[PDB]
Design a protein around this nucleic acid. Structure first.
Ligand SMILES: [Zn+2]
Ligand SMILES: [Zn+2]
Ligand SMILES: [Zn+2]
Lengths: 50, 93, 81, 151, 150, 97, 94, 128
RNA sequence: GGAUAGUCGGGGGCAUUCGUAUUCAAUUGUCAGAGGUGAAAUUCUUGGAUUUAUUGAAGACGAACUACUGCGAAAGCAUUUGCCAAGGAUGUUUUCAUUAAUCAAGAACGAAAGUUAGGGGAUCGAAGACGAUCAGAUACCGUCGUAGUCUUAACCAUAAACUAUGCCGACUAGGGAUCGGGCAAUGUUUCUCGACUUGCUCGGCACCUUACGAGAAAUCAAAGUCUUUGGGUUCC
RNA sequence: AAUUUUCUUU
């Protein structure tokens, strides 16, 4: 997730590293990469629920 | 003969379930039971099987496509594909 | 004014009018025979040509079509008749 | 405009961040009964630097014109825009930020545009109204030392 | 008074009073006739025939030297197209507009222009069927218009 | 009766023109119907030139101005007296006084 | 100039080969100058045709548009996958 | 070269005038005084007298730090609004000039729109 | 009618590019008012309001240039570029040869508002909520605010949709501006062309004076060429 | 800001 540009549309996103997919798995649903933060690397994303 | 003024494919439902619901189902089933063109073969032979799977027959290009519930491609997916294409070009260049 | 000779209008008053509006409508164009600067053949061309003119002998373009009179850029000693 | 980036001995160092024209000058330049042509282009330097530079130019009288319209047809406007585009690309093909600043102060872009627009409407008051910066290098932490250190 | 427009232009060509062959010319009549035949085999419309002959070869009006119109010459020598040039150009324009519309369905202005061209084509076809230039069962169908042009 | 030959706006060869907003009352007035004035005012009053000069830098720099285009509606212009009701004979003139 | 007009005038006066089997035959015989490959072609077939043209020193043009568009440009009512221009006639296709 | 240059923003609205003074940069400002804290009538906030009172109070607080010259920048409401500076702009300028603090680089930085969104009023406008 | 050459157009559609402004979000600086109004008042602000500074997102719109100027059958069309189809005028010793004008019935487009499903909803803002004015304000004023304002696929089909003025054709008075084209200058200017100046002409948008003429008059170059009443054709 | 009303005739 951290290697993707901001605003990209993704699916089957992991909540944790190695989780193997937790978010945006239902049909027609997706997750939006809102922003990045390198210092203590964390990515903010938008879930289908908003 | 026209055989149907407006119900069309929903004539199998008779008079029940409501007119608005029948109209919405009529639009969905018209999209669902439609032959589409294979983006690799150029033949109008793509048909739906089990709500999201689209296959076209023939001697070649027996591919199985992951599409929408009743259309091969949805507007949201096309917009996402364009957005991802744009982002990939910016990253590459 | 209020008394004119429409039978014989002045030449100056006629050359300043539109070709159709004249007493008897007539063309305002003509044909001229030009000579290639490095040859001897003579080719007749139209003053309002709409096509690229090429000399019969080994030569380049003669004139370029335009809305009105085409411009001659080759050094042709044209004779108009 | 300058962007403060580095601190050296309690004396902050800044870097080029863009140029613009005052509102008073822009309003004075904009006038009625004349045609204004404004264009833009994005340019790249030898290093990582994306600069979106604008340009604006106004039609001019010939000190003998009797009419007061002084207007140019849209085809001539498009031809003028192409001439500005060609001039910008030719003069900015390989400059880097040092040459960009060294050539914007004497106003060579506007002069070249006016020279190239000789075959079209003479044009006047051609200048870069605004230059915007979109990408930046890796802070140039060592190139700032290379450039500075003198006096 | 434009048939499908509000324009009132009067631009045209004013033929000279002297309905005679040019005083200073050597067209030789038959040579020009075979020259028109050569250009007809080359495949250019009669309007292009007159334009090229007037602009380049130096004959102002072909009928002045030949004695007949160039379309009459082509019909007499056998190289007569089945469709008249004006109708062919109108149908070709209609085909181009239809192709543009079928690729871009949102061009309402093009749809309006197609309606005008369709009306003009039908009026011209009715005139040609009445005079006898076309078979009385000529008709005009958009599906076969492409094959008609080609 | 037609009070004005032009119907109060410059609309010849057009079918529709965009509408602008009045500065005072924010009414939607057509572009060809809005009364336009150009306020070209120095950034300071003429009575503060001496004070600004005695408190300025840059060795007699040029004092800038402000250029504002004011577009009034009919009612607002009449109230503001930029445009005034004239006689029938004087209505047919357009040259500024 | 464009290429659709050039293709049309080669159709009027020129030598063309339609399809894949005949295109392979023409490339094999060596009487080939230009091959046109539609954008909807199978990737394996495109690689094979490119290899054939490289062996036979024939130019390749993978023009945009599907095989339906290629057939429409060719003036046929059926889909055309591979075009083989053997004689350009009076054109500059090659 | 013993002069220190700040940046004095003036926001001349028709309801209240802002006299904001910062350093040469944007952040880390020093003084911000309006007509609201100079007159308590809720009516003369935009009055020239209140504007000059706020301007001279800003001058005194700036002289407390020890800053000599200011780059002045006046600005109206801007955007999709009147876009004309109020009466307090000139009063603030004169008050700063009279207080003895140096003035330089006068400019108007009101935010102009490139045909921005709709203005309030409802077509017919504010029929007051 | 068609073709041809150089043009012209804020004419149409598709893709693409740019601009500030509005709102919102995060962060940084001092503090007491900020909005708004005739006056206010509602509301929120020592928990940091407002302002200033940096970055970003959303949607809308193309200010100034912009005009008694352009295009389109009209409704309407105003950021850059590219593509496609089409259009008027002009030039023409090019082509066809009456192919023409106006229309019942029948069809295309048809502002804004209004409807059905999908997306999006920044600003404004029907309904509504409060707060001031008034005897009563249910409204005009301030803030917020749903539908709506944007768009796609289907609908309808009217406005002071106006030039309150049907379309085609002939004639009729003097002048000066403006747009597009063409013609002419042993004209001017700038490192073969452009810009400017002058004259002529065609087609538009209009303007000033006047009334041979018309009208009941206001006024009209058509609303004139009508008791001296008849060019043709629809609507009413 | 704010300003509603003037019976039927002589
Ligand atoms: Zn397939
Ligand atoms: Zn030649
Ligand atoms: Zn107003």
């Amino acid at each position: 997730v951290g290697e993707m540009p901001e605003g990209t549309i993704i699916s089957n996103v992991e909540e944790k590293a190695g989780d193997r997919g937790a978010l945006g798995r239902s049909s027609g649903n997706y997750v939006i990469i809102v922003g990045h933060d390198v210092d203590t690397g964390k990515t903010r994303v938008k879930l289908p629920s908003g | 003969t026209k055989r149907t003024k407006k119900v069309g494919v929903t004539g199998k439902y008779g008079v029940r379930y409501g007119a608005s619901l029948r109209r919405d189902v009529r639009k969905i089933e018209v999209q669902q039971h439609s032959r589409y063109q294979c983006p690799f073969c150029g033949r109008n032979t793509v048909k739906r099987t089990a709500a999201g799977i689209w296959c076209c027959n023939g001697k070649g290009c027996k591919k199985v496509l992951a599409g929408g519930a009743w259309t091969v491609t949805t507007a949201a997916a096309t917009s996402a594909r364009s957005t991802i294409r744009r982002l990939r070009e910016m990253v590459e260049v | 004014v209020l008394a004119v000779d429409l039978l014989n209008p002045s030449h100056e008053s006629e050359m300043r009018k539109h070709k159709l509006k004249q007493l008897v409508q007539g063309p305002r164009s003509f044909f001229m025979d030009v000579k290639c600067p490095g040859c001897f053949n003579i080719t007749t061309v139209f003053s309002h040509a709409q096509t690229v003119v090429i000399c019969g002998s080994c030569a380049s373009v003669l004139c370029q079509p335009t809305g009105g009179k085409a411009r001659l850029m080759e050094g042709c000693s044209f004779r108009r008749k | 405009k300058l962007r403060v980036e580095d601190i050296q001995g309690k004396s902050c160092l800044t870097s080029f961040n863009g140029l613009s024209i005052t509102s008073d000058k822009l309003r004075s330049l904009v006038r009625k009964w004349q045609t204004t042509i404004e264009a833009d282009q994005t340019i790249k330097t030898t290093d990582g630097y994306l600069c979106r530079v604008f340009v604006i130019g106004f039609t001019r009288r010939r000190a003998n014109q009797v009419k007061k319209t002084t207007y140019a047809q849209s085809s001539q406007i498009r031809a003028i825009r192409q001439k500005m585009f060609q001039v910008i690309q030719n003069q900015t093909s390989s400059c880097s930020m040092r040459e960009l600043v060294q050539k914007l102060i004497p106003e060579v872009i506007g002069r070249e545009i006016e020279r190239a627009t000789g075959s079209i409407f003479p044009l006047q008051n051609v200048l870069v109204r605004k230059v915007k910066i979109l990408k930046a290098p890796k802070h140039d932490a060592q190139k700032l030392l290379e450039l500075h250190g003198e006096s | 008074g434009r048939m499908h427009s509000k324009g009132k232009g009067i631009a045209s060509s004013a033929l000279p009073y002297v309905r005679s062959p040019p005083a200073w010319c050597k067209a030789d009549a038959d040579s020009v006739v075979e020259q028109i035949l050569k250009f007809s085999k080359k495949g250019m419309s009669p309007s292009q025939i007159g334009v090229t002959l007037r602009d380049s070869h130096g004959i102002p009006q072909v009928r002045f030297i030949t004695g007949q119109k160039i379309m009459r010459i082509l019909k007499a020598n056998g190289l007569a197209p089945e469709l008249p040039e004006d109708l062919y150009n109108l149908i070709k324009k209609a085909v181009s507009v239809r192709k543009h519309l079928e690729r871009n369905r949102k061009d309402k202005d093009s749809k309006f222009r197609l309606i005008l061209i369709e009306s003009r084509i039908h009026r011209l076809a009715r005139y040609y069927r009445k005079v006898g230039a076309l078979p009385p069962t000529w008709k005009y169908e958009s599906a076969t218009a492409s094959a008609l042009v080609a | 009766t037609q009070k004005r030959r032009n119907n109060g706006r410059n609309k010849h060869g057009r079918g529709h023109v965009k509408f602008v907003r009045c500065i005072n009352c924010s009414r939607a007035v057509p572009k060809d119907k809005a009364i336009k004035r150009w306020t070209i005012r120095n950034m300071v009053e003429t009575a503060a030139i001496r004070d600004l000069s005695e408190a300025s830098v840059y060795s007699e720099y040029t004092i800038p101005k402000l250029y504002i285009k004011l577009q009034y509606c009919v009612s607002c212009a009449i109230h503001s007296r930029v445009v005034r009701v004239r006689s029938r004979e004087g209505r047919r003139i357009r040259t500024p006084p | 100039d464009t290429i659709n007009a050039k293709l049309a005038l080669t159709m009027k006066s020129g030598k063309y080969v339609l399809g894949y089997k005949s295109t392979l035959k023409t490339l094999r015989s060596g009487k080939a100058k230009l091959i046109l490959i539609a954008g909807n072609c199978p990737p394996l077939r495109k690689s094979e045709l490119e290899y054939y043209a490289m062996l036979s020193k024939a130019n390749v043009h993978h023009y945009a548009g599907t095989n339906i568009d290629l057939g429409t440009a060719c003036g046929k009512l059926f889909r055309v996958g591979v075009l083989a221009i053997t004689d350009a006639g009076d054109s500059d296709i090659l | 070269g013993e002069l220190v240059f700040g940046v004095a923003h003036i926001f001349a609205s028709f309801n209240d005038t802002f006299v904001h003074i910062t350093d040469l940069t944007g952040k880390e400002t020093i003084v911000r005084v309006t007509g609201g804290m100079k007159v308590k009538t809720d009516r003369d906030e935009s009055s020239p007298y209140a504007a000059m009172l706020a301007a001279q109070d800003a001058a005194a607080k700036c002289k407390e730090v020890g800053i000599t010259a200011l780059h002045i920048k006046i600005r109206a409401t801007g955007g999709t609004a009147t876009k004309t500076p109020g009466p307090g702009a000139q009063a603030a300028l004169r008050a700063l000039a009279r207080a003895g603090m140096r003035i330089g680089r006068i400019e108007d930085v009101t935010p102009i729109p490139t045909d921005s969104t709709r203005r309030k009023g409802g077509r017919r406008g504010r029929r007051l």
